[PDB]
């Protein structure tokens, strides 16, 4: 019943964990505690098998541990800066090749899976710093340029007409802009990792750069040159919605160094490169 | 069922492409690959006719390729400038003879058809540049003046009373103004092209200027003269809604030079005038 299911949603009790049943002393030739990890399987022994347990009714739920929940939180993926220093025409617009590889926080979460499929919610937080005192009337234009569409080379480029591309215009003082993007891949899922090349020569590119081209985000201050200079920083936040993920993997253990690659750097003292805190010895807790 | 149809809308699966069926080897005196282009028809041969295909279920849809979708995106058609330099009374108002011919991006899309009929959604994006520091309280008036109605000659002209004409008043800080316009032609469809004149003499006008008069858009800063000068640029965006189009045509291959005419200019090196990139020879891919 969709209404009972509804109540479970409100209470967050869709996925309940099992109870612990009462167990008793045993003397048997069946030894559940013994197994063989060589098989590649995890021994499914439970507490009732090793100790005498009491009956306990569980009230914990796994709803919050769902993939939708884990990846369904909006995190920063880019900080766009438009700093008017000495040339308005050159400094009032910019572009960014879109990716989820530049901020470690969300990158690491998505990379705990090999493939992922989801729709995207993008929320933008623009902040106008009054370097000279006044901000005037700031109007911004954020244009999504799919691969192949002409990229504007000036603040008055004809490409800004946005005759076909999607553009979002924001006016200072109005609420933060937000829009959704359908799953954009030409494949059935996004590659979080890709052990492949775009060719078969020594100069072929390796990794997700080959498969993950999502276009460019071009920004521009629509307002013409003003007396007072401003520094507009637009932070882009991304949230995955309607998510599916496949083939889990070990979490990134070292710092990221570059986009689209698993490359890392190691110091002479490797213990400083990982989160593992050195133990004094085996018996010192 | 309007609900099943509804789901198709949400999923964008209203127009599905056909499947590929499995085919087999053939030895026949029926040769579908042979035909005669002289007839003016396209040979309807499909992949199953030339190779042995496997069965594949298609999941692609043509919804996004619909005329409604193609022309249903808001693009800039005009950039109105009110630059207060040294005379508020003269520089605080302006007018524009409305047309969809000044911006190449949307003009080219509409011109891929001979006739088109649609309602129009106009969205305006005004941006006030504080040339001297402060903007004060900017209130704008955009009046739609149909052909024949009196055009204001001063910022305080009685025509601004808008006793009958539609005027849109916008206050700085408030959301972008927007309104719809019904199909305005005196004909059944707009002429994208018109091989005709408004008379039969050597001085008769030729082309769409004869048929496409949509009036004038008159703008004015309602706010009286302020100490600090501003430059208000209002960008007009147009989107076609409830669209129908007839008789498709070749896309514009060269740059546009003027409104309402197919006139073009050619340099001494014509290959620079078209998008065709010169080939080295016939066998160099």
């Amino acid at each position: 019943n969709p209404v009972e299911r509804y109540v479970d949603e409100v209470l967050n009790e869709v996925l309940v964990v099992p109870n612990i049943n009462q167990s008793h002393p045993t003397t048997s030739n069946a030894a559940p505690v013994l197994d063989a990890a060589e098989t590649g399987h995890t021994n499914k022994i439970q507490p009732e098998d090793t100790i005498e347990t009491r009956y306990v009714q569980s009230s914990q739920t796994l709803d919050e541990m769902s993939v939708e929940s884990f990846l369904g939180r909006s995190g920063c993926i880019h900080e766009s800066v438009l700093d008017i220093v000495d040339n308005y025409n050159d400094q009032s617009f910019t572009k960014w090749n879109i990716n989820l590889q530049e901020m470690a926080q969300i990158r690491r979460k998505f990379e705990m899976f090999t493939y992922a499929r989801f729709d995207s919610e993008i929320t933008m937080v623009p902040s106008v710093a009054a370097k000279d005192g006044h901000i005037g009337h700031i109007v911004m234009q954020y244009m999504y340029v799919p691969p192949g569409a002409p990229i504007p080379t000036t603040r008055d480029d004809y490409a800004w007409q946005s005759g076909t591309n999607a553009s979002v215009f924001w006016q200072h003082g109005q609420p933060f802009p937000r829009f959704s993007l359908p799953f954009l891949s030409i494949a059935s899922a996004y590659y979080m990792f890709y052990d492949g090349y775009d060719g078969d020569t020594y100069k072929s590119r390796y990794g997700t750069v080959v498969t993950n081209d999502m276009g460019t985000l071009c920004s521009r201050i629509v307002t013409s040159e003003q007396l007072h200079k401003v520094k507009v920083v637009t932070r882009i936040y991304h949230k995955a919605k309607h998510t599916k993920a496949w083939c889990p993997r070990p979490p990134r253990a070292v710092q990221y160094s570059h986009t689209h690659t698993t490359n890392y750097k190691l110091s002479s003292e490797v213990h400083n490169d990982v989160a593992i805190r050195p133990r004094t010895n085996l018996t010192t807790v | 069922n309007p609900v099943e149809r509804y789901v198709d809308e949400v999923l964008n699966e209203v127009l599905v492409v056909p499947n590929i069926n499995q085919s087999h080897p053939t030895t026949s005196n029926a040769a579908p690959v042979l035909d005669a282009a002289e007839t003016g028809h396209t040979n309807k041969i499909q992949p199953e006719d030339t190779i042995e295909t496997r069965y594949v279920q298609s999941s692609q849809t043509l919804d996004e390729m619909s005329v409604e979708s193609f022309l249903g995106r808001s693009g800039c058609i005009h950039e109105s400038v009110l630059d207060i330099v040294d005379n508020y009374n003269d520089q605080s108002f302006t007018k524009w003879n409305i047309n969809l011919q000044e911006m190449a991006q949307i003009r080219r899309k509409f011109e891929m058809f001979t006739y088109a009929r649609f309602d129009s959604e106009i969205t305006m994006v005004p941006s006030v540049a504080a040339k001297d520091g402060h903007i004060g309280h900017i209130v704008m008036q955009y009046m739609y003046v149909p052909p024949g109605a009196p055009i204001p000659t001063t910022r305080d002209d009685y025509a601004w009373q808008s006793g009958t004409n539609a005027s849109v008043f916008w206050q700085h800080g408030q959301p972008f103004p927007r309104f719809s316009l019904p199909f305005l032609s005196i004909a059944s469809a707009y002429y994208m092209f018109y091989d005709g004149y408004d008379g039969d003499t050597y001085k008769s006008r030729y082309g769409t200027v004869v048929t496409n008069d949509m009036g004038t858009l008159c703008s004015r800063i309602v706010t009286s003269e302020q100490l600090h000068k501003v430059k208000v640029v209002t960008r007009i965006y147009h989107k076609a809604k409830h669209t129908k189009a007839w008789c498709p045509r070749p896309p514009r291959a060269v740059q546009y030079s003027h409104t309402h005419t197919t006139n073009y200019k050619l340099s001494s090196e014509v290959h620079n005038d078209v998008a065709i990139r010169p080939r080295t020879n016939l066998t160099t891919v």
């Binding site: 209404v3 509804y6 949603e9 359908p182 | 509804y6 949400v10």
Partner: peptide
């Protein structure tokens, strides 16, 4: 777009836009 249930405790699962990408977080299971 409205999925109206009844139990009375009526549920209204409204979808305000015409594209699936627009809806909020997915249900579970």
């Amino acid at each position: 777009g409205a999925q109206v249930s009844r139990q009375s405790l009526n549920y209204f699962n409204i979808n305000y836009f015409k594209d699936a990408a627009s809806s909020g977080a997915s249900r579970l299971d």
